[PDB]
């Protein structure tokens, strides 16, 4: 089971790369009480994949 | 209006700064709002420029600096008189039994001067307790003080419960019970015992429980004492039970250390023998009335010499020492007949009949101690006729000093007995003369009065 | 399962959503000192005593000195990282700890953080660490037994639900073993157990937990750990964090048992904290209020009558009395009980179990010294079968202790006393017991009845233990219904006495040891 | 440190300066008396165990800007108690007592940027409703507080910064 | 053994959500970093003073 | 750091005019009370072992003559003395 | 960029600009003339001051010197490079050989391994010492401690344990010399180097001569080296020469750091100072440390605070005593105070446990008679007590043994006794089957068969 | 004890022996030399052997062998030589 959950874990690491950006934008918006359809997505993805 | 402000809070010690026209006097009581709860502080020292150092009579947590302190201009003062009988109160004279307002007519400050040497009156009226060994071997008079000495588990507390029951049921004397540093379990046991025995309506209870700051455990003895003084000034004869002098002195040590005083003999405060005297000097039989007292005094590690029990002996009139060894053989009240003593035990006051019966019991037992260690090595049969007879009477006396209590009725189921002094003397003298030599020993165990021995001997 | 990353991400979204971004005014101060775990904060006009001050990083300090122009606060965690000039906030909060039913079977440090690595808790909310015990009018007299499973203790030194019994003795005499057998024996009794360890080394906590796991007990108990490496504030506050987790049960009509291991190390941690705050020292350099430190801890062990429960649970539980039982442990140097902390806690508690190193060497295990051990609750807490039978053991041992002096001249003695002087040795050889082997009440009662009624008068001393084992085995198969009855009710009757006499008669003839 | 030993002299000097309506003169008298304490050499002489009044005299000699009775007397008492090094803090406590007595306070505005001067108006006005005093702002700028504003008054602060929102949120997660 | 397996699953889910939280708030900060605006910023000031 | 019984208004008096010996030095004022001992300020000409006469017709014995104050013990009930007398 | 402003004994106060003040446990540096001196900061007082301990001779420091703020704690070489070399408390090489070629350096202040990571093992370790593994057996991965006054044998015993277990163990080994003789460290180094095992051992030495800072912090350097080896996945032997000197060096400095004294003069932080060290010397799931620590007890008082707080940190405690060594019975282990966590039937098996407890019972019964024997003489004993005494006085001798490292003192060649071969001997003596042999037949022998032989020759 | 812990041995001179005219009153059994025989000339080392344990044994043997004695010829020669030595 312990070497199986290790497969589950890296599948989840693959998946979460997509949710994290949505989380970042939602947090930023609730913090600043405003919507921002940010332009320079470059910075978003540069973090979206580097440390993940 | 509130005219002072807190400036330090270190544990249970609080400092308050007043304008120099309004400094509280020593022992004055202050009040502060600990949020949604009221808290009173007792001034211990005036130091510096309007600053005052105080002990909190309550939990210290939650105090900010700069809170407004309003000073009462009177010491802690408590309700007194008949209104308090049957109630339970804390050091501040507030009810802790949920039955509501105390209905006091009058309030007295707990700090007051002891009677003058002029006001006392020496009267030798013996108390009658209904407990065979104490009435026989350690008599004590009105106005006197009794110290129950012993280690843990020997029966100080149940002996005091039985003394309360006897005095209140047979002689109708008001009693004040002051629990200095009281185990809340034993305090609830006491409350339910006295309410079951139906004595409660002739006792007023004051509890300073162990989980309370030192300032509470220290002052409680004075609250109980003040209630007793009110009853004395009504010309009654009251009786004051203090549940431990040892914990009174420990509270004194704590308060001393907290105030930062330089300690003394074995750690105790420097003022130990002054605190003890300030307390034990208000308990006296002024001409108007009387206060008698019996006081439990734990002896730590069986030394009888550390300053706390050593300093109290100077104030006691009779001392009853309880031993765990005797208790372990099952003969309660577990009093040691040889070690207990009294200043009132001399012919002039107790009468020759009593004095001689007491000294006779002592002689018999003091010889039986010699003989135990012959019987061990040689067996019984090598003794003389009178040696075997001294042994039989010694064992019968040693049995007959046990008694069943109305308050121990809950541990053993057997109903209690009250034995008048006439009957105690008559019984022990009858045993020593050899009138009852024809009964077996067990006829005397837990028997109560002497007639009950001749009755119990039938069924055995 | 975990592949449902939707759970993870949506849950983060829930934490985001409920973040109310509004601002709150707070009171502030600056560190002006750092040393040995104490910091001095200059500012915080509105700090309260006992308040939790909040440092940078998720760290806190307990403000203990409100001096005129400083606040002395003790850091609850590794302090070496703080620095002068850092800024600090005064929350309004007091220290609160997770509590509830889910903690059973978990290991947690004194802040209720899980330390065993089995994922987050499932608590039932929070509770204040520092509280005030039930008053005089809310107690109920203790009259129920809590069984240790030791012949030596449950007979001569009963412990009742709601009592506070001090285990005291020198190092390495079985103080921990006795308490942990007391905990194991509750694996099926309805009593929940809490074992809070002060200042022990971690690889010992792990060992006793591994033993509570061997036997069934771990699923029933909470472990609170303050290892010897943790700062003094945590070692000193751990017992309150444990009591607050036992009170969750007491205040809801259930029974609990809490075991403060080494109050003699809480006292040492508190001494360190006091001396670093420069508070005036007392005897042995212990601060003044080290009585009031233990007093308001132990007086939380209580039995509360059903009306206080109904008032607290707002009518949800009726007609049940809650109870919290404490068994603090103390360590005495060279058997000396006249030191500061022993002499305080001996005064607070309801009884004492004195463990002797000589008895422990001579082979007598558990080493309880019957002649100076006491229990003020006493027989009121026993099952009435035990209450009946143990009275005679008290006297047998008391006569043995009075005669024992002659044992070194014994050959000179007279048989009229030799009978007693051998019955004492046989009953003493009877109270020896192996570790992790608790006995039900039926077995202790049977084995004491055997010795009380003279059956052992002829068995030879060196065989008493095999006699006992054979008897306990025999009865378990050939008379099981009687054991069931006794264990289930503890009653006593001439009928039961006849049945026991029959069992002993049949055993002593028809079998062997 | 000398905060706790400056308090009595500060309070006494202020009481006197109130009874003689000379607060404003005392304040600068004390500032000068403080800066004399900071001199390379005087600070040496202040540590040398001179007898009190000889030290007092050597100190007064260096001051002609002290009113010849009351300032001298303050200095002489402080010399009697060997506390001359406390002047730097007697000064601060005198200033604070003046503030408290005149019911005038000072509050700090720390911001990502300078403000639009009606923001400052609303700020100070509402502060005089948080606090009763006449409030003197002194705004400052920083970018660790990338957005929002911080209002620090005495030791009570209201955290409106966005930084204090980010980190306050992160610790929830 | 089954209990141990379930405990490892809980532990891994938690240590995963920690990583995503870290990156989430760091990204929200990087988002504010370039949605910040003198007009919106002055609006923050206005709202906090109005709430003061 | 300890103050030595120099306090707000005494310091104010010394601010008024440093040498206050214009006051007759046969007399003083209490500045502290605790545990039966009192600190007296003034009493320039107290002599060690002297009898000091308190209000209410009581006495204290001057035992400590220090650089600024006289420490004395009270010969009777002390609880009702107060700073300023 | 900071100035000295005080020098009290070993502790030095340094003043920095308000904004630059160093953190706790950072290491500063001073040029003590034609020298270099390292200070470790201990406290941050207010006002930009910081208060530190000098890792060197404090003499020669003026007020007003200039100190440099290294921005990191003390860090020492770590790994295979450290191996077979002698090192200072600062991790400098102290033999005459070249630089340590280490790849990596670790700070000596670290946290203990989480409770989550500990490991627990019962695997017994055999030692050729009759008494130690009869009465106080200990396990691979555990802690052992030798308690004793001055001059009773806690160093010779440690050298025998080294000889017995450390040569017959494959992995690396670390020896920390804390505050003990330099002569002994030199003898040890040369014995290693002349038996070619030096290349498995790492040495660290802050011996009696050094100033208090070195004796204070050297044990942590030793621990850091052992902790590296542990975390590589190896298993390690860690011997500490005398751990009492660490707390003593703490006491020497405590007052100068301005801390109120405590029970018998000791520092207030005694138990924390000792826990924070004893708690990182442990085994773990990734590796394991077996450690033997000598613990001096001052004035032979086993209840002094320092031994009394150490007893709680050890698995197997061996307690030497002067009243046994004065009888010539080495090793002087007292069997009525030695003890082990491992002495359980479930671990050592019934027979060994039962033999150990029988020996203890006999020796205790013999203690209970010594007062009556002292007063009235041996003739007043019961006829069965004379047998208890006659067997105890044999058990005491048979607990004696000759050691390979004690040939220097006594000529007699050392012996190695296997456990199986000693529980048999003690079971024999207790059961009275060697009950026809004189006492001196058992003194300083190996197995029970060397005793039956020695009896023939007198 | 502090110094017994720093040195390489001790010569313990006992006052009981010294009063009995045994001078120097070197008490064997407590006194030891932690460097042992490594320091002695070869002749001295050969001759001395473990002599000091021989006198330690003789001196404790005299502890029981005054009021009574057993094995009373071999203990007798042990005592004889120990006495002529001392
Ligand atoms: N009933 C018993 N029978 C036999 N051995 C026992 C018994 N109880 C305890 N022991 C043994 O005594 C040893 C010490 O036990 P334990 O650690 O519980 O004592 P302790 O007082 O906790 O010591 P410490 O104070 O160091 O924790 C243990 O190894 C245990 O095996
Ligand atoms: N006369 C008695 N009859 C029965 N039990 C008694 C008697 N006296 C004492 N005990 C027992 O002693 C125990 C403690 O008694 P207590 O008076 O509290 O001792 P202490 O004097 O130490 O307070 C109680 O459990 C009680 O059962
Ligand atoms: N097995 C042994 N045989 C003989 N002498 C021994 C033995 N073990 C220790 N000793 C003696 O113990 C004495 C004390 O030395 P040592 O062990 O260094 O004490 P310490 O423990 O203080 O260092 C030594 O001089 C040595 O002769
Ligand atoms: Mg009692
Ligand atoms: Mg333990
Ligand atoms: Mg040594």
Coordinates of C-alpha atoms in Angstrom, one line a residue, chain B residues 7-12 17 51 58-66 88 96-98 151-153 156 182-189 191-192 207 209-214 217 246-247 250 253-254 257-260 263 266-267 298 300-301 303 324-325 328-330 372-373 375-381 411-412, chain C residues 43-50 64-71 130 132-142 162-164 279-283 288-292 295-296 299 337-338 343-344 346-350 352 371-374 376-377 380 387 394-395 398-399 401-403 406 412-414 416-417:
Chain B
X7 CA 1.0 49.6 38.4
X8 CA 2.5 46.1 39.0
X9 CA 1.1 42.6 39.0
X10 CA 3.5 39.8 39.8
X11 CA 1.8 36.6 40.6
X12 CA -0.6 37.2 43.4
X17 CA -0.7 54.0 43.3
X51 CA 2.2 53.2 46.3
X58 CA -8.8 35.9 44.4
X59 CA -7.4 34.7 41.2
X60 CA -4.9 37.2 39.8
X61 CA -5.2 36.4 36.1
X62 CA -6.8 39.0 33.8
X63 CA -5.5 42.1 35.6
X64 CA -4.1 44.8 33.4
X65 CA -2.0 47.7 34.5
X66 CA -3.8 50.9 35.0
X88 CA -21.1 28.3 54.4
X96 CA -20.8 29.6 48.7
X97 CA -23.8 27.3 49.3
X98 CA -26.2 28.8 46.8
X151 CA 0.5 12.0 61.1
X152 CA -1.8 11.6 58.1
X153 CA -4.8 9.3 58.1
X156 CA -8.0 14.2 63.3
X182 CA -9.6 22.7 53.3
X183 CA -9.7 19.8 50.9
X184 CA -12.9 20.5 49.1
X185 CA -13.7 16.8 49.1
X186 CA -13.5 16.6 52.9
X187 CA -15.4 19.9 53.2
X188 CA -18.3 18.4 51.2
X189 CA -18.2 15.3 53.3
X191 CA -21.3 19.4 55.0
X192 CA -23.3 16.4 54.2
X207 CA -13.9 27.4 54.2
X209 CA -10.1 26.0 50.1
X210 CA -6.7 24.7 48.9
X211 CA -7.1 26.0 45.4
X212 CA -7.2 29.6 46.6
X213 CA -4.4 32.2 46.7
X214 CA -2.4 32.3 49.9
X217 CA -6.0 30.5 53.2
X246 CA -0.1 23.5 59.9
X247 CA -1.7 25.0 56.8
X250 CA 2.2 27.3 55.4
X253 CA 5.2 31.2 54.7
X254 CA 3.8 31.7 51.2
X257 CA 7.9 34.8 50.5
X258 CA 5.6 36.6 48.0
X259 CA 6.1 39.9 49.8
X260 CA 9.8 39.3 49.5
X263 CA 13.2 34.0 55.4
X266 CA 13.6 26.3 58.1
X267 CA 12.1 28.6 55.4
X298 CA -0.3 17.8 61.4
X300 CA 5.4 16.5 59.1
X301 CA 7.5 13.3 59.0
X303 CA 9.5 15.1 63.9
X324 CA -1.1 5.3 63.0
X325 CA 0.2 2.1 64.6
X328 CA -3.8 0.0 62.3
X329 CA -4.8 -2.6 65.0
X330 CA -8.3 -1.2 64.5
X372 CA 4.9 -7.9 75.9
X373 CA 8.6 -8.7 75.4
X375 CA 5.6 -13.0 76.5
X376 CA 7.3 -13.0 73.1
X377 CA 10.5 -14.8 74.2
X378 CA 9.1 -17.1 76.9
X379 CA 5.4 -17.4 76.1
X380 CA 2.5 -16.7 78.4
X381 CA 2.8 -19.5 80.9
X411 CA -17.7 3.6 57.6
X412 CA -18.7 0.6 59.9
Chain C
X43 CA 5.2 48.5 25.6
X44 CA 1.9 46.6 25.7
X45 CA 0.1 48.9 28.1
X46 CA -2.9 46.6 27.9
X47 CA -1.3 43.2 28.4
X48 CA -3.0 41.0 31.0
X49 CA -1.4 38.5 33.3
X50 CA -1.4 35.1 31.7
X64 CA 4.0 36.5 33.6
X65 CA 5.5 39.8 35.0
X66 CA 3.6 43.0 34.5
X67 CA 6.4 45.1 36.0
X68 CA 5.9 48.9 36.0
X69 CA 7.7 49.6 32.7
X70 CA 8.4 46.0 31.2
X71 CA 6.6 42.7 30.6
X130 CA -6.3 27.5 33.4
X132 CA -11.1 26.8 38.6
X133 CA -12.3 23.6 40.1
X134 CA -15.9 22.7 41.1
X135 CA -16.9 24.3 44.4
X136 CA -17.8 22.7 47.7
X137 CA -21.5 22.5 46.8
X138 CA -20.9 20.7 43.5
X139 CA -18.9 17.7 44.6
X140 CA -20.3 14.2 45.4
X141 CA -18.6 12.0 48.0
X142 CA -16.4 9.4 46.2
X162 CA -12.5 11.2 42.2
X163 CA -9.6 10.6 44.6
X164 CA -6.1 11.9 44.3
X279 CA 11.4 36.5 41.6
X280 CA 12.5 36.2 45.2
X281 CA 13.4 32.6 45.9
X282 CA 12.3 30.6 48.9
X283 CA 13.6 27.3 50.3
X288 CA 7.1 31.1 47.0
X289 CA 3.9 30.0 45.3
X290 CA 5.0 26.5 44.4
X291 CA 2.3 25.2 46.7
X292 CA -0.3 27.3 45.0
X295 CA -2.8 23.0 44.7
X296 CA -4.8 24.5 41.9
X299 CA -7.9 20.3 43.2
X337 CA 10.2 13.1 52.4
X338 CA 11.0 16.3 54.3
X343 CA 6.2 17.9 51.7
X344 CA 3.8 20.0 49.8
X346 CA 2.0 15.0 50.5
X347 CA -0.2 17.7 52.1
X348 CA -2.4 18.3 49.1
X349 CA -3.3 14.8 48.2
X350 CA -5.8 12.3 49.7
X352 CA 0.1 8.1 49.5
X371 CA 2.9 0.6 57.1
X372 CA 3.2 4.2 55.9
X373 CA 1.0 4.1 52.8
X374 CA -2.5 5.6 53.5
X376 CA -8.1 8.7 53.5
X377 CA -11.0 7.5 51.2
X380 CA -15.6 3.6 51.4
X387 CA -13.8 -4.3 52.1
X394 CA -4.2 -5.0 57.6
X395 CA -4.0 -6.6 61.0
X398 CA 0.5 -4.9 61.4
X399 CA 1.2 -7.7 63.9
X401 CA 5.5 -5.4 61.6
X402 CA 5.4 -5.2 65.3
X403 CA 7.0 -8.6 65.7
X406 CA 12.7 -10.6 66.5
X412 CA 14.7 -18.1 70.4
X413 CA 11.0 -17.2 70.1
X414 CA 7.9 -19.0 71.3
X416 CA 2.6 -18.7 70.2
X417 CA 4.3 -15.8 68.4

